[PDB]
Amino acid sequence: GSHMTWVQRIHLALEEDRFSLYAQPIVPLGEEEGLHVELLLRLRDEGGRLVPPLSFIPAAERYGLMTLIDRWVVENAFRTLVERAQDPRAEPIGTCAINLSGATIGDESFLQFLTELFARYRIPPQTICFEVTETVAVANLASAIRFINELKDTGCRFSLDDFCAGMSSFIYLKHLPVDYLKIDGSFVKDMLEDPIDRAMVQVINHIGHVMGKRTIAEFVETVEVMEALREIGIDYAQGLAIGAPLPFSR
Amino acid sequence: GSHMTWVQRIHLALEEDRFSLYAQPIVPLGEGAEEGLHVELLLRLRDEGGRLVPPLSFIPAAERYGLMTLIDRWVVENAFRTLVERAQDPRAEPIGTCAINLSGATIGDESFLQFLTELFARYRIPPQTICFEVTETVAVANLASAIRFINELKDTGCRFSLDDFCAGMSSFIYLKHLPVDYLKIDGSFVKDMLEDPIDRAMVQVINHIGHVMGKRTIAEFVETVEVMEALREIGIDYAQGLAIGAPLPFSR
Ligand SMILES: [Mg+2]
Ligand SMILES: [Mg+2]
């Protein structure tokens, strides 16, 4: 569709509350901190059906609308953490991972928007871990370095997901002080059958060791794969074998 | 200079024997007495007043005017001729692996396989003695073409290497599709690997993925014995550079 069409669609979905956040648990694999989750965005269309990412994110990102979606995500995430904490039965979240678009890392107004949300929701910055794909960070490196350093001065943590998807040099990493490398799911799914996938997981584990970074495996779909990641020394696991995404935003 | 200027210059240098080959030794780092002396041939050009001409003062012009296939053809013929003369000398150290660099132009040239076939017929070098070498950059920039090239040479019995491995803007995915025998790690990583643990890590990682994908590894620019020892411990297969042996005259 057109520019105008996609601006309306994103605006309308925001207006009708058709975006929602789920929280997927991330479990430690070694020897204890609070609950670790990653927030996942869901969009339902006007007739109530799930819209898969590939049916809206590519169009939104072409028109720079992912700034709007990220701003909604962060506000609603913070609000939900606060409202959640007012239920004394809910267990505290120690790490709440939130994905950001490349458009957001290139937006110089974002730091101010975030600073204000921290003040208003009284969130300890250290509890938030912002997450960008390796690909997006590397394609926009000058932006990512400055972005990550500004946010780190705020006190929050940082993650690269889809890590090693481009099987590239990790030299750039000397300039991004991120805390976590989250292994691309493609490598985890087939690491038991395909020795390249296994090797890539060992490599990532090794970068973690050398750079004092912690690692997370995405797409951990069986307990056998979980066990192999544990043996290698991967720090955390996420996916179908660990626990389902749960409603987070009300 | 002009097209005609560079045609003349390259021809004249060929005519006056001002191109020459040197051989730099490449040492095994691991166990096994299999295979004799491993070398890489290096091209040098001297000008009319006897001074070396650095690569960047002639390769770009040759590439620009499509003269590089001709220079490579000279390199390979002269390498073969020298290997034969060396084999006839009972005192000379036998060569098990002679590595010859080729240009991107040559990987795209379908007349090269026929020229090489003819050189094997005439000079009767055992093909398995030859290892052709192209940079990763050049191979990946022309991937389908490199695959065809490497497989045709492989059917001849020759081996293959990618040098300047992991220089610039590269990915390991391509490697699964390039049936080469050796990866030669770029010297950028090796030079500072004792001081910089990122460079060290990158050497270990390359060695790891290379081994898992069926390749033997070579480190270039090994400048001290301590660097050689560190590469040995990691499991790098071969070393090359100042601590191992300087280039020696090869072509008469
Ligand atoms: Mg993520
Ligand atoms: Mg070479």
Author numbering:
A (entry chain A): 546 to 576, 579 to 797
B (entry chain B): 546 to 797
What's written in the study?
The PAS domain is followed by a DGC–PDE dimer. RbdA catalyses hydrolysis of c-di-GMP to pGpG as previously shown by high-performance liquid chromatography analysis.
Three metal binding sites have been identified in EAL-type phosphodiesterases. Nucleotide-free EAL-PDE structures typically contain one metal in what was called the M1 position, and this is also observed for dimeric nucleotide free RbdA, Fig. 2B. These interfaces with PAS/DGC domains in the autoinhibited state overlap with the interface in the dimeric form of RbdA, Fig. 1B, suggesting complex formation is mutually exclusive. The shorter helix is a hallmark structural change that was previously linked to activation as it allows engagement of the β5–α5 loop with metal cofactors in the active site. The structure of the dimeric RbdA PDE presented here is primed for substrate binding.
